[PDB]
Each structure stands twice: as structure tokens, then as C-alpha cells.
């Protein structure tokens, strides 16, 4: 995941404030920050005066300081605030545009942008054009992955996929195949897929007539809530209107026909930020249609099905004869070796199975779950909540094809005496952060938690 | 065989022996053990003295058995002669009379295991020939003996009796269905049948 | 078609204080295969549940646990008022496996010895979870039963799948004759509810007995943290309570002061008692066609009332089970919840 | 982790006048109402769209405000619907006021309010088995005079406490009125792991609210903000009325009595005592 | 069986319990070997432990199964001392005198461990249990055969000693034939009848060994309506909702709250001299039990002299701890002495208060 939040902080500060002028964008980005930062920001928003950092330290206690650093580093990186070495101290305060926009949003501000929606006869039916948006999303997914017939006419969308290198397909020969990007597209279920596509449209649509402030205004206004009336008609910039038409083509806009009307708020824009339920001629009833198969016997038992879904399953398992409720497929080392040929790591698939194919594995994941977390301290043996056997077999296939070991962290030095090194090693063993250590070299390559805690203890 | 070892491990055995005094002693110890904790088994003879007068109440009897069906002609022909007289003097054939006597003794044995209606208890039999005699039995025994309970194997027998014992153990005391089969004090008889004077 | 208790006819007295001495059964019988793991494992699990529950609802009582292995009664938890000790003891047992025959007589005698110190106002009790179909006594039993009833010691037992004559005699004997306490089970859920109904105090129709005022005092929490110091376990504990009279620290509990020996409570225990003393009238199920009342809930706001003429559906019933004194409706969920968890009737509170 | 903050605002027009009587009449409850609306919106925004609920307590009963029982049969705009609906309901309730409303001043239905709110929490939690709701309610009370401590509601409050603890529902309370520490409420917040706030009258709470009435959803690593000590030296003697320390509690009655036993028939349950036991007590 | 004075005088039992717990023997000796407490009252506190122990002890197992079993359920382990060896043999002895007598008689010679029990298998386990061996292995020799002969008439005389005049409901004897003098027939082969008599006799012996018993209104509505209006009067400017208004007021609120956070934070939910720590712990336990005995006695009451002895001892203990604190301050210095004083403050206060209370009561009684 490119972690669009990282792209957000990527952009410079002045354009960040340019975006913060739009209160709805302020709210939407408030939705994204880690909870610690959320709470701290909500504290600061009202008392119109900077605050010393010492208070914001003493606010948090023990065994939870890691999140303090997470929040402060994130917020500084995206520069929502302005640290102030006023008297040599730290006089924190938000980018005041952010503060005022947010406060306006909380109590009836002047955000005509966020208020761009119009209330009228929302003749849009729940299934009404919702099925059409779902069908468009399925069509583009199939065309990108490659179906027997790809009716994907998104010439702009195809150009974005190709130039963006969305999938390892020979666009010169017209191929739309799964690359590392294609593997990720197979991985990111909904939010991941929509996010990758939005980032691709951003990167491709970045040359001329961008108006990035208007771009994000339109995007978040779409994700915020149903603008409905007068959206497409009134509430859009010129380039904003063009981007809206393009998104509506991309499915992310459920604009009605007649090419001129209010905004058509498809559920997809909601899906962009919701991180919630995923379900979308005139028939389609399934809260658990996807009937995948995955047990301890490493077999594929399917009753429920979805053609693109089962094709995704086939992307790492053989197909011989499609059946009524089943499809001939058995997951083996060869089955995942198919994706290993694409170099697909046995990592995304883990959480994928934990999440996807569950419409047919609800009872399976419940019996594996068994609520064996509160019962874990008492009964020390887990009831295969997340199947470890399958994980071990997958790791074995991955190991069979790999043979290389790597570690994260950074090399450390200036352990002048053996006493500091030994005490830090003991503390790390207490906290389980030392990958490896040696007093002879006074060096190691681990996470920064031990150094952080020692420095905090020393300075304060 | 070792068969007796197991029943020893569970309950008590109290055999029936020809001398009457020792028999009485054994029988009373059987009662004393039943009302005590340890379960106790008394095995006796249908023709024998035990079945004649001794009673078997709630505790003292749960599951009678009838290993085989009692018949006499094991021994000599005095029965043959009397039966000859029977056939010539009364229009009764041999096997008819023999079956009649056998079921007489069988019913006499079986009836002992109940005293009131609060009491209860299994009453098994055991022989191939029993299945056709189901009509020879006294009526009130026959009623409880439904058709589906015929020539059962031992295994289904144990299943059924287990279910019985459990079910009867329940305090199934609606006390309003007992106004049907108890005709309570001075009234339900009075009311019901003083009206039934029809 | 209803399954309700008609009326409660001892809503005047219960044994609020208790000293219940649960006695399990760990003997070769409990190893048969009728309950899912066995008799024994399921038994101990439910025993843990019952321990938690009972020490909740009767938070002023004590309890002791007794097993019956190899014909011996081996105390596995002194009579004590701290649930955690008993919980741990049961934990320990559950990993150990039964043997020998259940010696009901020995367990009974050990209990009768055990409950001697319990004072007059406190009430005694035992709860035999008898599993087998026999006993093995080293003495007369009716002797013991007579001694028991002489010492005013009610006993309730929960047989497994049978009825044993002596146990029936036992329950009928100690409980002032009135036989209702030998309930035996026929299903696991029946077993859960068996323990549940064992939790509550136990009235039948109490003989007029001595009723006695009991001295006790309430503590006040402590403040300091580093001054950690304890007078009931002789440790350092970052802060606890003070006996109002003995005036010595005591680790958190409703326990008895370990210095001047008077009972300690806050009040919430007394509040639980109050809840048990004077419960509500059982909520009535309103007539199907004669109600003509509001179409909602009252405590909650549910939309489950009727359907208005639907051949058989409306002919079924009208979910309006409505309490008497406040005479306000309540959907089934609300009535179940009121009569189970919180006993302040919503409407009957308000007037 | 969604949370169901179910405020319980009591509004006694008697106590409302007392609030006008207290200090100056420099502003009616209107301040409190507006601050409550804002705080409610704040919570409604904070989490991932987690519901709310509000109940009142007028002089002659209680009635819901937000969930808006079936009647017909800006900013995110759901804020809009919640707030406008609440205010319409509350104005409707204010129409429900007259002399017959002035009549039944005998009681104060706060206990009914808390109990019903807890029932509501149970309803919502039970229906929404999926995505278990870490719910927690609130209490806003206009602290008035004319009753130093009404006690006829003592028990139902504690029953509320026990229900709360079993249901795992912290219950925070904000008393606005005279410097009279609402003892039962104080024990309620302290026992059920809450927070007590005895503000002065006329300050715009919104700061107090958003500070110390927003940290109870599903956090609890954070020091609560409770006032001075919460002494559990509980109820005064039923007979006497003076707070007891070394209590003397009868029996099955359970009433707590002072060092003054009437010698017989504890004055809440007709139970004559063993005069021998009386002497044993008198042995001091 | 268990009495307060009985457990008080059960000196061997008390010393056994001393052996029971190291903590127990330690506290007892330091309450005794330190010229402290007579054991009598020391146990007078601990009586329930004694009762429990005693009951846990004298617990005769049942006869019954294992008793029987010792003839049936025990036919395999032909090796050395089998399961419950001593237990099984004592069950045998109580179950059957003959084997006990034979084994005793065959102690000075002929070991009854291996060869004794080997020949016993044949002899007894044919005599009792199964059918008459008669032929086959007739190893029932010497003591075995002698005891066989004995046990015959012995069981006979036992059975004789068993005959009650059974109550006339069951009296099969008087029931059979002892009404009439009749002439029947009879037709329904020795041995095994003895087997049946054997099982009857065993059971009855068992049972008998068990019977053995061994402004308001107006202005109210006015203000209410005023507020109702104000609400209805548009208003409700959530912008105007305080925010914090007076920055000063805001600050003051924050001050209050940070003050309270600090104070409640002061609740951080490790001694130096481990040997002195343990010693002080011993002193605390000592003073605790000493005060325990007083606060028992000073409440309860005619054993005034016992209270006097307790009080004198307690005053001695108080002075002892005072000297302890003096020595601690001298040696460990101040910080360690401060920690010791903190650790002992509660108990010290309690004992001092007890002393003062006794002084007050003594003055009251005297004056
Ligand atoms: Zn302690
Ligand atoms: Zn005390
Ligand atoms: Zn309801
Ligand atoms: Zn009611």
C-alpha cells in the first residue's frame, strides 16, 4: 500500500494549507489520522492559544508512548501544526487555516464547498444505478485482470493502467496481466483497489489543468456524503467538472444520464473512506455469495461463487471443469507456485483468505475463531482461529522457492561503556526489541524503541 | 466365565437356595441393600417359593427379567397323564394348556414389581417363543406392550430402558393430568361419576 | 402455551448470609461418556461458573470445596470468602483425574465437621454434585443424617442420570421434610440452570428461628501508594482499606478483619441482598385480543407488538407481556432482561 | 470502536427556576441545551458513526428525545437531523408544561431515567451482536435546593449501578447547582468507573464537557478527572439520619441503624429481637 | 471427637502440625523459643487447623469393594508387592482373620512375601472365590490347610452368630411349610451350593461390619417559560456556546484539572536490606499475633490475669521494637531506617493504640 496518507504529507506545506482552506477536506483528513493525534487535535482546536509539549507528554502514561511518537511524527510530517521553539520550549499549534476550517465545519462554517450538495427529488434507487456502478467496477476489474472478453472501454482508464503500469500486461500487445502491480490489484480487495486506482489517476492526471486543490476538493466532496442535487450542474470547477466526468466514467461517480444534472453519489465514493461493508440485469442477492473453499485438507470446496471472484481464486489454483456450485480446483504447492511464477508473495493472500472467501467460510472462521482469545490465557492452546497449518505449508513453499534472510532496523553505535550496552540489552530483552546484540562491537540493528526510551529517561 | 466378576463390581448378588431359612435371610439382606446404597440382584425361580408371596415395591424392584419362559415337562410324564385327562375331558390341547400355565406363572412373576402408581419399573422378557404369546398375557400388561417392542435385541433394549429410567426420574407431576387418573378427594369421583350415573 | 411460575409464596424470608460447602465428585464413575468431554470435565467447568456466580450474588458468604476420590473426602479449599482461591483450586483439580468410589458418608462427615465454626446467624448448607450410583461408607449413614439434621444443616444434591434412594432420603430429611431439593438433571442446559437456581438463597417455609443482630463495620479506602503495606497478607500493597475499629490495613475484600475480627462490607453487598429479598410480581402476558394498548415497548422502544389479523399469525399471540403494579407493557426481551438482570421495574419505578 | 453515548438530561422547571434563582437569572438552561447539542455533535463526529440517545425527566414523567419514537405513523447533515429533531422534541416537551404539571412535584424521576436508559443500552447491544458497542451513558442534572438529599430514590440508583457494572457501561455525571456533593451520584460515578463534575452554573460547559466527558468511550488508559475523595462511609442511620461509621444493621430487614437500638422491632421491619442479643450488644 | 480442650491437649498432634508447615513451626518457636507464648493459647487461636488436620487423619476407608476385590479384583500381578500392597493386605486382614493369623504365624520362618503369597494363591484363592479346586494344584498345605480346616467351622460359627429372628414380614422360614404338614413332590449334583453360601456370607459379613457402628410554582413556571422561549427564540448559537469564553476561566479550569490529574496520578500502582527486611517481617508477624491475642482477650470476660500477662508482654514487645528502631537508625543510617519505620508504621500505630486503650480501660476500672 502506497498509504495515501504518505502521499498527503508528501505534498509541500503551502499547498497543504491550500487544501486546508476546504473544510470538508479538513474533516476527511481528520478521519484518517491515528486516534492519538485525533484526540490531541480535537483538544487543540478550541483553546485559542499554543500549548507547551510537556502537557501533551504528561497526558499519556506508560505502555502507550509508541503511539505518542506515531502521532507527533505523522502530524509534523504533514505539517498540520507548527512546532514553535518560542522560548526554547515547544509551542504547538495547528496550521491555523486547518484550525479555522475545522472549527467552522463543527459549528456551521462558510464551507460552501462541503455544502455544495443539493437536496431534491433523489429518484436514485438503492439498486437503481447502484447495480450499474457495481457492473462497471466488475467490468473494469475483469478487463484489467483479463477476462475471456474484456468490454473495458475506459480508454483513459486503460491509458492510466498502462502508463501507470497497473498490471504486468503487454499493453503494446494489449495484454492486461497480473504483475507485481497486478498481484497487488488482486490483493487489495476494495479500499486497496480503489486507492491504487485513485493514486494512478493522480499520477497520470498531474501534468496540466490539474488544480490539485480542486482535485482533492472534488474527491473528498465525493467521499464525504451524498451531494445529490446540483452537484454535477453547479458544485464543480471547470477542471473539477472534467475530473468528475472522468471519475464517473471510472465508476467512482454514479452520475445519471442526460450528461447534465446534479451529482450522482454512487456508493463507491463512500467505500473510499468507510472501511466497512463491501457488497454493492436486475438480480443479485448475496451477503455471502462468494463461496470459496479452504480447510485443513488444503482443498477447494465451493457452493457460493462469483465469476470474477472465482477467477481470482484460480489465479493461484488450477481449473479443470466448472461445476454448478463448484469449480474443479485443488490448492497445492503447485497451485500457489502458479502465482510464485508471477513472484506473488504468500503474504497478501493470508489476510485475503482471512477476509475474502469468508462469504462461504463464515462458519469456518467462527469455529476456528471459537473466541479463543479471552480463553487463550486459561486454555494455553489456540483453537486454530487463524489456521497455522496452512500458514506453515505456505511458508514452506515460499521457503522452498526463496532461501534469503533479512532484518529491519538500523545499525547503532556510541555504546561507550559496557554498562550502558548491557543495561540496554537487558531492557530490550524485557521488551523484546533486540534482534541481536554484542558488547564486543557495541553495535546492533534493531528497532529504535530502546534508544527512544533511554533518551527520554535521560533528558526528562 | 468372568461374567459374575463385573456384576460383582457393580451390585450385590443374592442367589435363591432350596433351604427356606437361608432363602429368607438372603431376601431380607437384598431388601436391606436395595434401600441402602449398593444395588443388589436377587435371582430366583419362577416356580419357586420366592415368586409366590414376596412383594417387590418401588425400591426393591426395578427391572425384573424372565430368563426363558417357565415350562415343566423337563421332568416326567405326570403332566402328560394329567394333560391326557385334560384333552379327553376338556376340549383343550396340550400346547394350549402348557402355554396357558407358562403365561400364568410369567404374569404372576411380573406383577410383583409394582405396588402403587407412583412405583414403576421395567419388565423385560427373554425368549424367541414369547413374541407370539403377547395375547396370552393379562390385559394391563399387554396394553403397555406395544407392537414395536417385539423381538427387540438386547442393545435396543438397553437403549429403551435407559430412556425410560431417565424419563420416569423426572418429576413429571402436572397434578392436573392426575385429576384424570387419581379422582381426587371426595369430589372428582363424586362429581364425575355421580354425573356418569347416566 | 406458556411456561411460567404461577406465584412466589415465600417472598418474606431467605437465608441472606450463607456458608455453602460445594462437594464435587471425582470418582471412577465420573469418567463415563455421556457429557461431551466426560461427566467430570463438564462438571468442573460448570462448577467454576457457579463459583463465580454464587460469590457474586451472595458476596458475604463463604464456601469450601470437597472432592470424593478413592472413597475419601480430601478438602481442596478451606472455607473462605475469596472466590479466587476456590477458582484456582478447581483449576488445579480439573487437570487431575478421578479414581476410587464416591464415599458419600465420608464427605458428609467432613462437611459437618467443617461447618462447626460458622456462627448461628450465618446459615449452613451443602451441595452434593453426586454423579455415581452407589456409595461406600465406613459407618452408619442414618447416624450421620440424624447428626446433620440435629445440627441444622440443609443439604441439596444434584444427581446425574438416575435417582438414588438414599440421596432422596437425605434431601427429604434435612430440609425439614419438605422434599423439593433432590432435583436431578436430564440435559446439559438443565444442568446450567440447575446450578443457577442453586445460586440463590433457599427458603421453603422457615420455622421461627433465632434472628440476631450482627456487628460489622465498613472500611475507607486508603490514599498513599509508595507506603504499600498489608496486614492480612504481610506484603507491600499499594493501598487498601482500614478497619474502622481494629484500624489496620486489609487487602481489598468483603473479608473479616484479621486484627479485631469483625465483618467488613461496603454496601453494594447489602444492595445485592435487598435485590434478593423482595422481588417483583411475575410480569403477566397480556391477552391477545383484549389488550388494545400502546404499540411500542415501554422501557425500550421495540416494534414487536402484533400484525393485526393474519389467519394464524395474529391468532398466535400478542407480545405484550406486561407487569402488574405499573400496568405498562414491555416486549419479551425487556421483560426477560428485567426479571433476570436488573430488578427495578422500569415503569413501577416511575409514578 | 463505536460508542453509544446516551445522555440523560433532567429538566425540572422548578430546578430551572432555581437555576434562574441561583446567582442571577443571567441565562436559563438554554446555555446547557446549546452546549449539550454541541457536545453531542462532537461525539457524533469523533467515532465511526456511532449512534447516540437522549432522555429527559420533566416534572410528571420521562420521554425520549433523540431516537424519536414513531410519530408520523447543515454539516454532514446528520448532525442537522439529530439536532433539529431533538430541539423540536424538546420544544414539544416544553409545551407539555402547566399547573397540573406543577402538581406532582413530590418525586424526581431521575432514577427512572437512568434505569430506562440502561434498558435502552441493553436493547441496542443485544440487537447489534455484530460490532459490539462499547456504550456508556451520561447524566446532566440541574442542582436545585428545597431538598438537601432526597433519598426515596436511593435503591434504584444503586440497582442502576450494579446493572451498569455487569453490563460494563461507565456512567459519567455532571451536576450543575449548589455546592452539595450528590452523594449517591458521587458513589455511582466512582463505583461504575465514571467521572463527577460539579460545575458552577453559568459557565459555558462546552470546555468542561469536551474535556472530561469525552474520555470514557473505550479508552481507559487515561486518568479520570474526579473531584476530591469519594468516601464510602455510607447511608446515615434509618432511624437517626446521622452518617454512620460503625454501623449496626439488623437482619433480614437490612436497614442500617444507629447506636440507638429501639430495643425491639427495628424501625423498618417488624422484627422483635432477642433481648438476650440486645444485652449481648449492650455488653460494651 | 474434636473438642477445644482436646485439641489443646493433643500435644503429639500439635507437634505433628508443627512439622506440617515450616512457617507454622517458625512462628510457633519464635512465639515460644523467644521466651514468648505458652503453646496452649497459641493453638487456642489456631484450633480450626487442628480440627481439620485431625479429621483428615483418622479417616477409615470403607470395607466393601476393596475388601472384596482383595479376593476377586486382584488376579494378575503375580510379581512382587502389588498395588496398595500394605493397604490391600490390611483390607484382607480386616476382611478375613484367617489369613492375618496365618501370615503372623509364618513370620519367624517361611516368608509370606513371595512364597507365602504364591502358596496362598492356590490355597485361599481356591478356598474363597472360585469353585472347589479339590484336585489340581492342592498346594493348600501346612498353615494353608490348617487354616482351611479352621476357617470352615469358623465361618460356620460366624454364620451362627449372624442369625437374627427376622421380623415376620420376610420370615420365609415360618412362611414355608411351617404352616402345614404336607406331602408334595419336588423336582428342580453337589458342590457350588457352597459357592452361593460363600457369596451370601461375604456380603452379610460386610454389611454387619457396618451395622457395627464402629420562586416555586408561579416564578417557577415563569422562568421555565422564559427558558423555553429563549430556546424557541432561535438562539442556541453553538458558536456562542462558551467555547471557553474567558481565557482566564479556561485557564483556571485547566489548572483545577491538572491539579487533580497530578494528585490521582500519585498512585503508582523493593526494600534495601533483604536480611533486615526479613527480620523486620518476623518482628511484624510476632507483634501481630501478640496483639491478636490481646484484642481477643481485652474484649474477652473474667481471665483478667491472662490479660495482664498479655499486656505486660505487649509492652515488652513495644519497647523491644523501639530498641529495634534505635538499632536500625544506628546501623542502617537514616534512609534505610526511614524505610523500616515506614514499613512498620501501621503495626506500630496499632499496637500503640492498643496499649493506650488498655491503659484507659485499666484507669477506668481502677478509677
Ligand atoms: Zn493483604
Ligand atoms: Zn479490625
Ligand atoms: Zn422493550
Ligand atoms: Zn411495573
Author numbering:
A (entry chain 2): 7 to 286, 328 to 507
B (entry chain 0): 557 to 754
C (entry chain 6): 107 to 457
D (entry chain 4): 22 to 94, 113 to 323
E (entry chain 1): 168 to 355, 368 to 393, 465 to 519, 537 to 567, 573 to 639
Please quote the paper that reports this structure.
The versatile nucleotide excision repair (NER) pathway initiates as the XPC–RAD23B–CETN2 complex first recognizes DNA lesions from the genomic DNA and recruits the general transcription factor complex, TFIIH, for subsequent lesion verification. Here, we present a cryo-EM structure of an NER initiation complex containing Rad4–Rad23-Rad33 (yeast homologue of XPC–RAD23B–CETN2) and 7-subunit coreTFIIH assembled on a carcinogen-DNA adduct lesion at 3.9–9.2 Å resolution. The coreTFIIH contains two helicase-family ATPase subunits: XPB(Ssl2) and XPD(Rad3) in human(yeast), and 5 nonenzymatic subunits: p62(Tfb1), p52(Tfb2), p44(Ssl1), p34(Tfb4), and p8(Tfb5). Altogether, our study illustrates how the Rad4–Rad23–Rad33 (XPC–RAD23B–CETN2) complex recruits TFIIH to damaged DNA in 3D structural models and provides the groundwork to visualize how the NER initiation is carried out in multiple, coordinated yet distinct steps.
